[PDB]
Amino acid sequence: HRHNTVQSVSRVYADVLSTKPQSYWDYDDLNIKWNPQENYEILRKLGRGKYSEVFLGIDLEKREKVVIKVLKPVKRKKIKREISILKNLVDGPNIIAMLDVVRETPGLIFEHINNIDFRSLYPTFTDYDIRFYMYELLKALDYSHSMGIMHRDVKPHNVMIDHDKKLLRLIDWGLAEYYHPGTEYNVRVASRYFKGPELLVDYRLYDYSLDMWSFGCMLASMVFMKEPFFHGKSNTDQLVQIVRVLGSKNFKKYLEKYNISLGEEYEDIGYYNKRQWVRFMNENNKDLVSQEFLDLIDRLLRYDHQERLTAKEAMKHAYFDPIRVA
Amino acid sequence: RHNTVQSVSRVYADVLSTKPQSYWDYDDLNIKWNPQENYEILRKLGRGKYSEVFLGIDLEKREKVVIKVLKPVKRKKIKREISILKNLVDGPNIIAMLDVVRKTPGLIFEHINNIDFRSLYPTFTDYDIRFYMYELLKALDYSHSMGIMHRDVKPHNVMIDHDKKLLRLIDWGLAEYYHPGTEYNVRVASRYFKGPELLVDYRLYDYSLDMWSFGCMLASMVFMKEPFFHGKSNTDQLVQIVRVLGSKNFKKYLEKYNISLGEEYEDIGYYNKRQWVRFMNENNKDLVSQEFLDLIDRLLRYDHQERLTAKEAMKHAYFDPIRVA
Amino acid sequence: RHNTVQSVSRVYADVLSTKPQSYWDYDDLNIKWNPQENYEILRKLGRGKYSEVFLGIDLEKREKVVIKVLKPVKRKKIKREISILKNLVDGPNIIAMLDVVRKTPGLIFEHINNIDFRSLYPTFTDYDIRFYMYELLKALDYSHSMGIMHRDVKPHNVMIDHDKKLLRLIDWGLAEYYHPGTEYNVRVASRYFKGPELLVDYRLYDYSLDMWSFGCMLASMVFMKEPFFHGKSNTDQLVQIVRVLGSKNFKKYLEKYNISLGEEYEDIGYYNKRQWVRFMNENNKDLVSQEFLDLIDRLLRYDHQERLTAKEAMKHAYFDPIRVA
Amino acid sequence: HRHNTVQSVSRVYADVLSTKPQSYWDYDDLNIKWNPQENYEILRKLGRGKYSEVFLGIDLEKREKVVIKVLKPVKRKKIKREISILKNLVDGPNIIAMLDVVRETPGLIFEHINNIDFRSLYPTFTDYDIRFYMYELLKALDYSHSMGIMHRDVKPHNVMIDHDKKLLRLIDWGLAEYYHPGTEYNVRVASRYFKGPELLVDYRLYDYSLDMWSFGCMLASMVFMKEPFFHGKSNTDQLVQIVRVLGSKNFKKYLEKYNISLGEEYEDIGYYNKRQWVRFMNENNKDLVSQEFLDLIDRLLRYDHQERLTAKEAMKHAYFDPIRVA
Ligand SMILES: Nc1ncnc2c1ncn2[C@@H]1O[C@H](COP(=O)(O)O)[C@@H](O)[C@H]1O
Ligand SMILES: Nc1ncnc2c1ncn2[C@@H]1O[C@H](COP(=O)(O)O)[C@@H](O)[C@H]1O
Ligand SMILES: Nc1ncnc2c1ncn2[C@@H]1O[C@H](COP(=O)(O)O)[C@@H](O)[C@H]1O
Ligand SMILES: Nc1ncnc2c1ncn2[C@@H]1O[C@H](COP(=O)(O)O)[C@@H](O)[C@H]1O
Ligand SMILES: [Cl-]
Ligand SMILES: [Cl-]
Ligand SMILES: [Cl-]
Ligand SMILES: [Cl-]
Numbered sequence A, D: 001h002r003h004n005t006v007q008s009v010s011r012v013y014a015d016v017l018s019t020k021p022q023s024y025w026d027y028d029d030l031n032i033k034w035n036p037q038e039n040y041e042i043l044r045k046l047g048r049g050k051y052s053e054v055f056l057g058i059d060l061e062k063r064e065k066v067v068i069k070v071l072k073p074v075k076r077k078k079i080k081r082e083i084s085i086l087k088n089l090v091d092g093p094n095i096i097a098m099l100d101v102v103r104e105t106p107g108l109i110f111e112h113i114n115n116i117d118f119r120s121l122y123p124t125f126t127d128y129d130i131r132f133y134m135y136e137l138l139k140a141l142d143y144s145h146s147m148g149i150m151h152r153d154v155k156p157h158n159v160m161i162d163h164d165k166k167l168l169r170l171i172d173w174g175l176a177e178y179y180h181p182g183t184e185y186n187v188r189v190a191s192r193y194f195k196g197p198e199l200l201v202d203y204r205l206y207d208y209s210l211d212m213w214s215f216g217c218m219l220a221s222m223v224f225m226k227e228p229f230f231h232g233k234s235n236t237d238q239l240v241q242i243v244r245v246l247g248s249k250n251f252k253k254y255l256e257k258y259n260i261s262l263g264e265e266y267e268d269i270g271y272y273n274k275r276q277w278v279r280f281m282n283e284n285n286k287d288l289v290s291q292e293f294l295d296l297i298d299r300l301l302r303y304d305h306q307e308r309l310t311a312k313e314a315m316k317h318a319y320f321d322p323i324r325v326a
Numbered sequence B, C: 001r002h003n004t005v006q007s008v009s010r011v012y013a014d015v016l017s018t019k020p021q022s023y024w025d026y027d028d029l030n031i032k033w034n035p036q037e038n039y040e041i042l043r044k045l046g047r048g049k050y051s052e053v054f055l056g057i058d059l060e061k062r063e064k065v066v067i068k069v070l071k072p073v074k075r076k077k078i079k080r081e082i083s084i085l086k087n088l089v090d091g092p093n094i095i096a097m098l099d100v101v102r103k104t105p106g107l108i109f110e111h112i113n114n115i116d117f118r119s120l121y122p123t124f125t126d127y128d129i130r131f132y133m134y135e136l137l138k139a140l141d142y143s144h145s146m147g148i149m150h151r152d153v154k155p156h157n158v159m160i161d162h163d164k165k166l167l168r169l170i171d172w173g174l175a176e177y178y179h180p181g182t183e184y185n186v187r188v189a190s191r192y193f194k195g196p197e198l199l200v201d202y203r204l205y206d207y208s209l210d211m212w213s214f215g216c217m218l219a220s221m222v223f224m225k226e227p228f229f230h231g232k233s234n235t236d237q238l239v240q241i242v243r244v245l246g247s248k249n250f251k252k253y254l255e256k257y258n259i260s261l262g263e264e265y266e267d268i269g270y271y272n273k274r275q276w277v278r279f280m281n282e283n284n285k286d287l288v289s290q291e292f293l294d295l296i297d298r299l300l301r302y303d304h305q306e307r308l309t310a311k312e313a314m315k316h317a318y319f320d321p322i323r324v325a
């Protein structure tokens, strides 16, 4: 007994990839047909990871602004995986639009969003600005989940917002992966402040519920005015900050339910009792904190990835009633 | 004159005292007219008792404009509307009169892409109502701070481009400068949004008339009932107002201003005041908040002096989920 | 069938040979209808012999949309228009049919803010004519490259938002897929923009019919004379065409296709061909360029085969001051 | 005889400042009433001179994008001069809009223009894109000239263009100065590639004609596809590149007409004959070069600042006929 036989299957959108052609999910055999690259000239470097280098660009023929993303030519399966996902989510709500793909180092052309950084735009948000833009983020998450794709990197950095147009786009799909039921995925995904408990205990049978925990970490940070909500120094300490809030009783139960072998590096985790979400409320965030929010955030930040609210169920929560169009 | 109990606006009463005679003297104004051929008519927009509104084209800019041509029977009033639109050019959510042209005079307004109110308002959320009415309060507070009453606040005169989240208050033909101690014509605004001061012929009103008209718009949008005060006439309009606000506060309102009432309501009854929460049904319960009931109670009042001013309404806790301040 | 001299499009003839039967078989199509209550009617836009167009509201998006409701007398044709609009969703300057709804069927189109043509076109510069007609050629070349003739190119079917420099070709009810060797109904397009092939009952036409309609639009915009071929009827429409293009080239056109002419033009005269520069007066001399006269001569021709294709017209030197390529 | 008595007066807009109140042109006694500065937060530094430092900003209350320009607190007359000119040209065609002024180092808040740099957007221009945007630049120049203000720094850097909206704005008024007839101004204005001959020979009695020469240097560069048109290594060599094209006969005449004492540092300037503007035409720029352009550029790049075309006269030239709305 090496693999785990106690296994999880997504409650929603479990078998959507089985109803699509092989060319949809088989990104390794995708055939990218490249367009001329001199139709786009680099203006300014927006930033860089070490998997990528994004720039501000010019569609020399269309003379609009676009964002070019030069990928490292060291990996191809990850390269064609991102192009595969963006091409499938081309007509999705609040999904970043991929306009072209060039080479001669593959370059991916995205639409430019006149956005403002998150460390400055969010502190200016009101109560209904949070409920609105998060609902728009749920629209993008629910679509790709319905298309068998989990983002696996939901964070305020990867969420562009054009507040002048009330526009939101979810970007950075380099970590997104297709969901086949029963698949064991890499746990080294997302970022520390938004990693789910399944990633910190090395439970590889996760589904779209991963993007849901990162969404809860975002919503809890903006409403409670604490960035990040779970502030951990390490991946080991990140789980401690989660057990500190959700308690140890439900954590050990989450492990016994899915028979997760918790490495005894987490033995130093002591007894923690579950806290009330109301304890994080102060004079600054008291207008953003509501009874509807405290209920929604309680059903989002769960150990059990199956008992968490789906993107569609979160949209129907009463917390978005003052903004939902009927 | 006309002997009556006096009343002065408790706010923005001495604004015109701080401005030259050039500001409010709308008859001394000399208008520099411009050629009318720069604008052509595309589609007729709205008829009128005193004007006609069309869809226009700015032949050099080729953008969309709105032309309001007037019958020339009134010089002093025509100059009054041009005087007011020229004083509120920097006003937030105030329509921007672009030019005047020449027979008859024509006024060029900026074009706002919008959907009619009773086709757009039924789709408004709690967010949309608090956001847009706060934008409307921005226009009312500025014009009042400039010494100008609108005297015709109604959803027809509120242009909303929802795709751009814009709001523009339009139609300033019934507007007027406010000088303390001046009877204005009670034949202003429209029936469903007339204040009790217009219905009892109390002519010394002020900016608070627009606040009653604002409360009529808000109460109907929240309670989902247009109009909120459905009246057959200006006499029945008052009866429908006291049917809700009560006979007790109505008696105190007539005593404070010594209002000798008309013979027609002879058969008016004693209406016990109905609480504001009694209008909350299962269809609008999500729009009826506890802070709204406090706001709607401090706006819809007989005595115009105890009504909330525009600025006082913008600082109310009802707009907390939408206000940046 | 009907015995005649044959003709095949020299371009884009085998496009439908490269696509599945699912593409052009518009009767096998199964449409997934959607609720109509998501869209409400605000203002009626245009009447029609076969449809009615209104201004709409996308109750959830609350943006402006355009609803074209149809009489249900024709299944196969209704499916034909939906089939064509669904194949050109990525087409440049093609109108984006957003949804179909349900009695009668309704088609949701995107809304374009624009001014009527004969109020906007008189304000067009040399820049505006070359730029916008090049945008219209983008829509024609794409639909032709997709095997679809429009068969109704006219300024009424060209929506221009000049404030955003946008152009959208609309009204694809008369459109049709092109298969080589197929008589199409000569009762297409409108009188002022009908090609000579429709007027002599030559049914084996192709995409070049839209190019004659394009040349009629361009020649009138440049020479400032709408319409360029003013005809009382479809018979007089031809007489006005040969009055300019000449009887000599008309004889060669009837010989190449063995067109036995109708009895009605019995009294037609011999018109010497009038040069294209003779239409340059002092009012349009700044719009009449030397490269335009070459372009207008290679577009307005009897023989549809020798007319310029859409792509050939876009690469013409007339669009050099505006084309990026 | 120390000052010059052979003197020049603007052919147009000579006495416009005499018809405006004293508060209009007397910028030294302007009273700036500052607004709170924490309503604007700095996002990214766009660039810097050593008289200024411009940043990308956020109207925290309006949540739109603005450009903040923090001036050095070393000079005040130049500080209030720029605020004086921007406030007077507030409702001008294609003039950059000043929205607010803050302190606590004075900070000037401008409207943000979604523009693209000039070294990349101009090589994509067509024939009618040049005629259009230059006509829009003439609209801004003619307005401020009609308001008694000369920009004195017209260059492609100081011209923002939102090609997506067909929008143009003339920025950077730190060198702009009010025009009083008979005034001797500082010749150390503008930039080398666009300095007029009056600046290179130290003729201080120039008027709005200064902005006209810089406009001609811009139009000649974009049509002939040579940036810059007069490429000089120094201020002394810059005049040599001008005499190289316009000839020495008209130059010595320009000096004898206005009795300009040319420092014998320019003695090494030899005999130059006037060239034909047609000689700068090649296969690349032959579509942009037209008979109407060669006439307009010949009447713009003149030694005599009085004989140059005004901004209004340049707008009525036949070169802008295919784009001018009648
Ligand atoms: N579509 C876009 N529009 C505007 N900025 C973008 C876009 N995509 C990425 N960025 C910027 O690129 C940076 C992130 O790059 P990276 O860290 O390489 O993922 C941030 O500054 C983002 O704001
Ligand atoms: N500035 C404007 N922009 C767009 N529509 C307007 C404007 N002004 C008036 N309308 C229309 O005119 C009607 C209002 O009545 P009136 O003010 O009499 O024209 C409504 O149908 C409005 O949509
Ligand atoms: N998508 C659209 N956007 C704006 N106006 C339209 C649209 N489609 C049709 N129209 C209007 O409808 C008329 C054209 O005739 P029809 O296609 O029969 O409605 C003109 O008045 C157009 O302005
Ligand atoms: N209103 C504006 N919108 C966008 N960029 C601007 C604006 N004003 C100045 N800049 C930028 O500021 C830089 C010039 O700053 P400086 O060299 O200090 O004058 C250039 O990168 C300009 O594009
Ligand atoms: Cl499912
Ligand atoms: Cl397949
Ligand atoms: Cl373009
Ligand atoms: Cl607790």
Ligand SMILES: [Cl-]
Binding pocket: B019, B020, B021, B022
């Ligand atoms: Cl005074």
Ligand SMILES: [Cl-]
Binding pocket: B185
């Ligand atoms: Cl009156």
Ligand SMILES: [Cl-]
Binding pocket: B246, B248, B272, B273
């Ligand atoms: Cl009572």
Ligand SMILES: [Cl-]
Binding pocket: B289, B290, B291, B292, B318
């Ligand atoms: Cl509330």
Ligand SMILES: [Cl-]
Binding pocket: C019, C020, C021, C022
């Ligand atoms: Cl097939």
Ligand SMILES: [Cl-]
Binding pocket: C185
């Ligand atoms: Cl047919």
Ligand SMILES: [Cl-]
Binding pocket: C246, C248, C272, C273
């Ligand atoms: Cl002949």
Ligand SMILES: [Cl-]
Binding pocket: C289, C290, C291, C292, C318
């Ligand atoms: Cl030409």
Ligand SMILES: [Cl-]
Binding pocket: D011, D012, D013, D014
């Ligand atoms: Cl003058």
Ligand SMILES: [Cl-]
Binding pocket: D021, D022, D023, D024
């Ligand atoms: Cl003064």
Ligand SMILES: [Cl-]
Binding pocket: D062, D063
């Ligand atoms: Cl806002």
Ligand SMILES: [Cl-]
Binding pocket: D274, D275, D276, D279
């Ligand atoms: Cl020469």
